[PDB]
Design a protein around this ligand. Structure first.
Ligand code: PLP
Ligand code: PLP
Lengths: 358, 359
């Protein structure tokens, strides 16, 4: 039995993949794949509408937000955000609490002079994040940009933002759909599809409508929020298979009880794994408890000379893609929505009996 | 049997789809889909390298061109072309002979003041194109941009360019890999994958290496050819499944005998279908002989009030997605690489039966 702990692209719900396999060649009796049909067919149109509706229901998006499906991954959004949003102004506030937040800053430097606010705390060797209340924001920022779940670091910011009428932008790539969020606190939420949804080549953007209409002329059109909104995300040919699949994944999410039920399953999973790490000195995670990601769980061995053996023996027991980042070394288990608790139990059994042996 | 004449997204080769179906859930024995793994895995990196290599061999790409796999579709290249290539030049030459070449112009207006050369001819009701010899090009232009196959109009420019040290950019979306081309005559070739590869969500860009490094600062990194090239199209997460499938397409092309065999097959398929249109007054095509696309074949009926019955009866026989464009009405058959001659035959047999009835 195989479990795939890959950080992105990532496991898809087993049931979504089964259904997709089933209809790969004959979709809805048409004798063609979903992949070979026009995005303007009645049939694809339905997928496009059902999936927007299903997403609004799951996350409870208000009517004043546009729901866009975009080419280009989240790194496109690192450019598309400043281009759409800078408006008449000359910078925005960028909250820097890890790699991906840093990445966005580095692209922002093409379009502005980003005000880099470092938010990382280091109390007792543990790494955490400053409370929002003390973040040193500008009066003049076009917006405030932050990453609520840092996929490499295993650091989440769980608190909802309650800033002014400041425009908040959040890269939710690696934790979107993991629990409910209060969409109304946000200007833009974006997420590359390939992590906590699963399929690569699609990016989700959710945009408050009043923010449209101020995009810079240099912004290529396929990344213009207004243009996408005016064309129901079909200004050009969309990544249709990816969109159909994300639609399957929204269906599956509703079958499971929605994001209230995802929150419970995901807390249960994280507590299991973090528990297995914390019971013993043999493994270590050095993120502050309050800021621990449920989605991405990095960890190291007291004795790092065992990493390779740990990874090879895990893989032989079917536990795949657990290699950590170069900097930390050690391990990272990403345990997204698709990952059932039995997946995580298999990993922690394995961790236990690896410590027994060595 | 179903045959699917959709213009884009389009039919994939049947054998590619039977293979993908069989490994959808357990690829390579790993117990997982190719959709579910790192783009930085040895397994996916092997896919990436092989695909690039099979492409180079199929088209005979020379050593000094980069092969890039990109997000965004060809509409993204309408911006990515000017931003990558303008340098300190104010304008670029835009050859205009139809819809898709027109669309490139409007996007380029964001970045430059394009020089719009109207290249269409009109003789007898027959639409055609000026030979490249007489194209009124410009000396100060950053490059020349044209579309050798206009998907909606059914108009192709077969002539390979022979301009001097001018940089030629071409939108080969609807005919890349239909036949051999002399890649050395171009600066940039690009193509959305959804047609004559077939899989949507990936775009091909072939760029002469010396053209890299003049990118404007405003260009989003994911669209910067030099960045793509420096990172082998894995600057960000690629459309893994799409790229894989394209790779299957490349292998399939190789098993069929390469682009020289495609040319013969595609020739014979067009000849059959244009044969069915020409031999009777019931169907019509108003594109000059010399400019007739082999890939997209619009055509109308003498009596346009049969259109619905025709489309409807064709569908009942397994012939799908043949509706034309509304300016023209009538029909359009796209008959890309994946489509076998048998497919085109069922359409011409159908066309004959229908004319027999209602003619
Ligand atoms: C010749 C041509 N160019 C461009 C495009 C647009 O491609 P996309 O919808 O990927 O931006 C199409 C479709 C096409 O057929
Ligand atoms: C992976 C990741 C990105 C980059 O995603 P791409 O789709 O490869 O551009 C950005 N932000 C976060 C939090 C991520 O995990």
């Amino acid at each position: 039995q195989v479990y795939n702990f890959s950080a992105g692209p990532a496991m898809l719900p087993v049931e979504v993949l089964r259904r997709a396999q089933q209809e790969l060649r004959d979709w809805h009796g048409l004798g063609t794949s979903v992949m070979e049909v026009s995005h303007r067919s009645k049939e694809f149109m339905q997928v496009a509408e059902e999936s927007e509706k299903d997403l609004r229901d799951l996350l409870n998006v208000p009517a004043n937000y546009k729901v866009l499906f975009c080419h280009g991954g989240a790194r496109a959004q690192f450019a598309a955000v400043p281009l759409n949003l800078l408006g008449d102004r000359n910078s925005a506030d960028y909250v820097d609490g890890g790699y991906w937040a840093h990445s966005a800053i580095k692209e922002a430097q093409k379009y502005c002079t980003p005000n880099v606010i470092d938010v990382t705390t280091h109390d007792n060797g543990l790494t955490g994040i400053q409370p929002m209340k003390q973040w040193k924001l500008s009066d003049n920022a076009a917006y405030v940009h932050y990453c609520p779940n840092e996929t490499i670091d295993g650091i989440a910011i769980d608190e909802q933002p309650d800033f002014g009428n400041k425009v908040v932008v959040a890269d939710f790539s690696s934790s979107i759909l993991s629990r409910p969020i209060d969409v109304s606190r946000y200007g833009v939420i974006y997420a590359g599809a390939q992590k906590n949804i699963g399929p690569a080549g699609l990016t989700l953007v959710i945009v408050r409508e009043d923010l449209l209409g101020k995009a810079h002329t240099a912004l290529p059109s396929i990344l213009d929020y207004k243009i996408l909104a005016d064309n129901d995300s079909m200004f050009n040919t969309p990544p249709t298979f990816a969109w159909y699949l994300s639609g399957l994944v929204f269906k599956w999410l509703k079958e499971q009880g929605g994001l209230g039920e995802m929150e419970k399953r995901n807390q249960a999973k994280a507590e299991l794994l973090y528990g297995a790490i914390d019971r013993t000195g043999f493994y270590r995670n050095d993120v502050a408890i309050t800021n621990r990601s449920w989605m991405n769980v990095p960890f190291q061995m007291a004795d790092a000379s065992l990493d390779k053996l740990f990874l090879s023996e895990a893989e032989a027991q079917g536990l795949q893609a657990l290699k950590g980042h170069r900097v930390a070394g050690g391990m990272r288990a990403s345990i997204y929505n698709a990952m059932p608790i039995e997946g995580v139990k298999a990993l922690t059994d394995f961790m236990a009996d690896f410590e027994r042996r060595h």
